[PDB]
Nucleic acid binder design. Structure first.
Lengths: 60, 165, 170, 278, 200
RNA sequence: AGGUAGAUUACCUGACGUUCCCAUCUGUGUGAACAUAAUGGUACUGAUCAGGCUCUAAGCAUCUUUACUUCCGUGUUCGGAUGGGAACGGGUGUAUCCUACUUGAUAUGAACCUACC
RNA sequence: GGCGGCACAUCUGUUACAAGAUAACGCAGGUGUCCAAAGAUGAACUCAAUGAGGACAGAAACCUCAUGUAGAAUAUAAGGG
RNA sequence: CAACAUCUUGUCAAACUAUGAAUAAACAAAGAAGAAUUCUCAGUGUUAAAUACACUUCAGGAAUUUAAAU
């Protein structure tokens, strides 16, 4: 008893009922795998600004 | 019925341009890609090492990270019913600087030129200039006269049939 | 002060190959004769394709050597003296080179042995002019102009002046 | 006749001409795009190379860095300005090729402003030993790259004499001392060649074999009065006179282009002569 | 024997030329495509009458040899060997397939073996064309109408106003001949080339 | 005007004859030394007696090629749409998009940095 | 259904409809391997073929010059490079 | 006779192709939050050294204009 192997009939109108789920803007801002030298400059400054910010907070 | 090879159906997709074989240019390896630029992926079959997948050939992506010998490029790939974010790492030989914003980046300059004058006219008191008009589709043309001194007429009628043999 | 000094046809090469059809044994002696005749160790040429009709791919077949300048000028006389400068007019290629083939190596009869045998030889002479280097230098390798290049007639006159050879159109 | 000429219009249509500077055989493009590809994380940082070329009379040394518009030259020191520093004849030898390298390095450092902390070697005894420049205080040496072009790197090539002057002049060029005139024997074998050793030993030998060959090979040497013993002390004074001051028309129209009107009028005359011939 | 002509009439399937992938094709039934006096100069025969096919179908190679025989026998009998030039302008470049089925045999589970050769024509595509002098034109139009009975579908005989296989009309060939723009090749003409080096 | 390094990679290529070289580049003499191979032919090194002979470069031609423009042609094909025609085969009409080969006219370069004249 | 075959894991070209996916026991074929070098790097050189020539040598042996956009070679099947 | 070159002629290709549509595919048309200008300005690196360049919430901070960009 053979059968129909495959058919794309209706498979594209199904996907447009709930439309193409675009990615959120948080997905475009990942910093994984970036340049190891760039990620070491960004870390070395964020630590520097935070240390001077927390010290000023402690002073007041 | 096709196969599952990585580079299947590439008789005409990877073939080099006619009389374009051999080495690439020297501005391919000299353009400077900075993070946030719009570049176009174009698979180069001459350089096999690092050839991007054939489904990304011609897609436009944003440079997200510039590594010493490869340029990170992120594109949107379509899946069953959702759009995912793909983060490749393509060597500069396989990508081309896209000029999608060629028109946009020349509108910014025109506005910036005007706004520069408005900070001088206002300081010196002159009436400031108005910003450039926005772009509109081809608007309906108005009514215009036509002179009767440089005019000529050609009668138009259906043509009598002439046999082609 | 005419630039005719820069068209002096000179002999800049001479090739003597002994194409024996057998590998080794006989060939090794074919190199010995070329060592005495020229004074420099010859090279060995291997087969290009294997043909059963010739009993021949990597097996050494022939041995050829090149000489230039003064050393190649005298050996050209010996090969011509055997022919007595009677070179056929069909021995000159359209590129300006001429050649001839001798059957017995005269060599030296003082120390001659039947072990070596009798080996034939082919003489090929390449003619040139000052300025032919532009097609052999590594940097900016180019192609010589057609006016500077030699002809079949240009090679005939050179052979009919220095050696006074008689060309036969038979 | 039996031709089968493979030059027909069906053969030119498929033709792919090579790059222009490769069509002339002047640039090795495969090994040039390795001296030009800078790390992509260094955005538009220049990558200098030393372009060393030897003509029949002049040793050309330039420090250049690539660009999209075209290769740009930072500094250049030819070997035809040696007569200013004393060296009058033999401007293409191994000894004059060391001077132009030293002349370039001291000209470059003076231009940038690092000629005070980068002195290299100055004496004559140490001219035979490899000297790799080192970090000074907290300022690294200027870094270049030799670009020999289409010249083989044989064990005694002159192009590494220009490199020899650079490293002894202060500029840092990455190298290994296995291709100078030394790389064997001792340092004096290299030192002698830097000071015209291989040239002085020629005329002290040709003058003893044939007095007419000596005239032929060194005709302009004898007329200038440069004895073989004086080569060591003319090159040493050249090095002393390079360090103390290294800080640096007529046109002949030929043919012109024939305009369109003259071009089309010539054919009509040629056609008329063809027609009047019959 | 041979399958009825109505089986392989409609044009279906991708073109199937004889090549290294399709091995074992019976040869075409036609080998001589040009008949008559093929060496007569262009100006000898001014009158040209075509056969135009008006149906999209497969004219089998058996219907060209069988038609070429009819034109040759009915034109030698009426005009002569030297008085006409008829050229068949379709070649059998398509291979029809057949699945010979013998019930102690396989079902519909296999491909087809090569059957013959046919030429894919379309609407308005000239099949056969000829040239002859004026005095023998009525004796060739009659022969051409007899040849349409061996073809399938609708065929239209068109009396072209052009010259003997050239593109110019019956008077433009006279203008170009007297000016000097026509150079003979024995059977065809050649344009006078105003390009390339000026001769001596 | 010339040499070095280039970017665009035939408007840059191929063939036929051409014109200067004053500087420059090339060709040019040679083999003691590093170095080189069967050959100082190549690469390597030392040099300056002559040379524009070939290079290179500037020009020529109803020059092959190639790069722009018109024509080819709204003809091929095609998106949309009948209870349109035909027994089929195929092919209209409407609102639209619109090639290619050929051929004809033009062109045979431009530019960036350092040096010398 | 059986017998036959593998469309059962897998690659190339085509059917395939100039993005991606894409069927038939559709077509033309291929894999269960081979390699201490056929991996890596540097240097030198230019290949198949044709024309002209050189004793035996000729349609095929070796050598020289000219032309030679890859018509050669790259372990294999095909397509790319 | 032929064979080899060359200039034309008639007809073809799913596993041929120089050129190459229509329909399409994926971008941009101002969201570290709606632009811009000026001044000031630090941490890590790249660099021959930077006052260049790269990342740092267009690091940060202060004023002026500003709702405009099919």
């Amino acid at each position: 008893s053979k059968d129909k192997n495959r058919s794309s009939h209706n498979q594209s109108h199904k996907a447009h009922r709930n439309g193409f789920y675009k990615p959120k803007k948080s997905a475009y801002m990942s910093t994984k795998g970036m340049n190891v030298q760039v990620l070491k400059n960004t870390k070395a400054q964020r630590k520097f600004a935070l240390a001077k910010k927390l010290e000023a907070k402690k002073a007041a | 019925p096709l196969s599952n090879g990585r580079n299947r159906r590439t008789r005409k997709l990877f073939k080099r341009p006619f009389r374009g074989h051999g080495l690439s240019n020297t501005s391919t390896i000299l353009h400077t890609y900075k993070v946030g630029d719009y570049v176009t992926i174009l698979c180069n079959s001459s350089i096999q090492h690092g050839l991007p997948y054939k489904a990304f050939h011609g897609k436009t992506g944003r440079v997200w990270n510039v590594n010493p010998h490869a340029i990170g490029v992120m594109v949107n790939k379509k899946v069953n019913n959702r759009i995912v974010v793909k983060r490749l790492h393509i060597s500069p030989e396989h990508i081309k600087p896209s000029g999608c914003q060629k028109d946009f980046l020349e509108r910014k300059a025109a506005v910036a030129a005007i706004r520069k004058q408005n900070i001088q006219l206002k300081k010196e008191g002159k009436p400031l200039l108005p910003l450039p008009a926005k772009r509109l589709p081809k608007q309906p043309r108005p009514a215009e006269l036509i002179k009767g001194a440089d005019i000529k007429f050609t009668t138009v009628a259906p043509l009598k049939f002439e046999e082609l043999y | 002060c005419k630039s005719d000094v820069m068209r002096k046809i000179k002999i800049d090469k001479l090739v003597l190959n002994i194409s024996v059809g057998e590998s080794g044994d006989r060939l090794t002696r074919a190199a010995k004769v070329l060592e005495t005749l020229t004074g420099q160790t010859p090279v060995l040429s291997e087969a290009r394709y294997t043909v059963r009709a010739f009993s021949i791919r990597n097996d050494q077949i022939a041995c050829h050597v090149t000489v230039r300048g003064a050393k190649a000028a005298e050996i050209l006389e010996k090969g011509l003296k055997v022919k007595e400068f009677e070179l056929k007019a069909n021995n000159f290629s359209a590129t300006g080179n001429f050649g001839f083939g001798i059957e017995e190596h005269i060599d030296l009869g003082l120390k001659y042995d039947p072990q070596v045998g009798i080996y034939g030889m082919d003489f090929f002479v390449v003619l040139a002019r000052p300025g032919f280097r532009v097609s052999r230098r590594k940097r900016m390798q180019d192609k010589i102009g057609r006016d500077h290049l030699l002809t079949k007639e240009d090679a005939i006159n050179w052979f009919k002046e220095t050696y006074e050879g008689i060309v036969l159109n038979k | 006749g039996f031709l089968k000429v493979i030059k027909n219009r069906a053969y030119f249509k498929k033709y792919q001409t090579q790059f222009r500077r490769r069509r002339e055989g002047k640039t090795d493009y495969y090994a040039r795009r390795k001296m030009i590809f800078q790390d992509k994380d260094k955005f538009k940082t220049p990558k200098y190379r030393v372009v060393v070329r030897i003509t029949n009379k002049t040793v050309i040394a330039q420090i250049a860095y690539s660009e999209i518009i075209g290769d740009k030259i930072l500094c250049a020191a030819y070997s035809h300005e040696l007569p200013r520093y004393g060296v009058k004849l033999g401007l293409t030898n191994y000894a004059a090729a060391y001077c132009t390298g030293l002349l370039l390095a001291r000209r470059l450092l003076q231009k940038l402003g690092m000629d005070k902390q980068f002195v290299g070697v100055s004496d004559a005894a140490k001219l035979g030993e490899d000297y790799t420049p080192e970090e000074v205080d907290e300022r690294r040496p200027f870094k270049c790259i030799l670009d020999v072009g289409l010249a083989r790197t044989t064990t005694g090539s002159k192009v590494f004499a220009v490199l020899k002057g650079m490293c002894d002049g202060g500029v840092y060029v990455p190298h290994s001392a296995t291709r100078f005139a030394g790389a064997g024997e001792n340092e004096e074998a290299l030192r002698s060649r830097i000071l015209g050793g291989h040239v002085a030993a020629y005329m002290k030998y040709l003058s003893g074999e044939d007095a007419d060959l000596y005239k032929k090979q060194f005709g302009r040497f004898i007329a200038a009065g440069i004895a073989p013993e004086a080569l060591e002390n003319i090159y040493i004074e050249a090095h002393k006179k390079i360090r103390e001051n290294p800080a640096a028309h007529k046109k002949y129209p030929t043919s012109k282009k024939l305009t369109l009107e003259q071009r089309k009028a010539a054919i009509q005359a040629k056609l008329a002569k063809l027609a009047q011939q019959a | 024997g041979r399958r009825p002509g109505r089986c392989y009439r409609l044009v279906r399937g991708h073109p199937y030329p004889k090549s290294k992938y399709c091995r074992g094709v019976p040869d075409p039934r036609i080998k001589l495509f040009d008949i008559g006096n093929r060496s007569a100069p262009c100006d000898d025969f001014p009158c040209c009458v075509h056969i135009v096919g008006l149906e999209r179908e497969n004219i089998s190679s058996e219907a060209m040899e069988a038609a070429r025989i009819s034109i040759n026998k009915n034109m030698l009998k009426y005009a002569g060997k030297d008085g006409f030039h008829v050229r068949i302008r379709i070649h059998p470049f398509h291979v029809l397939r057949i699945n010979k089925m013998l019930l102690q045999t396989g079902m519909r589970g296999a491909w087809g073996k090569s059957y013959g050769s046919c030429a894919r024509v379309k609407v308005g595509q000239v099949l056969i064309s000829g040239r002859c002098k004026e005095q023998h034109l009525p004796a060739m139009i009659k022969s051409f109408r007899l040849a349409c009975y061996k073809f399938a579908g609708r065929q239209k005989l068109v009396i072209s106003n052009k010259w003997g296989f050239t593109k110019y009309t019956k008077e433009e060939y006279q203008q170009l001949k007297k000016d000097g723009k026509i150079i003979a090749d024995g059977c065809y003409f050649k344009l006078a080339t105003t390009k390339g080096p000026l001769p001596k």
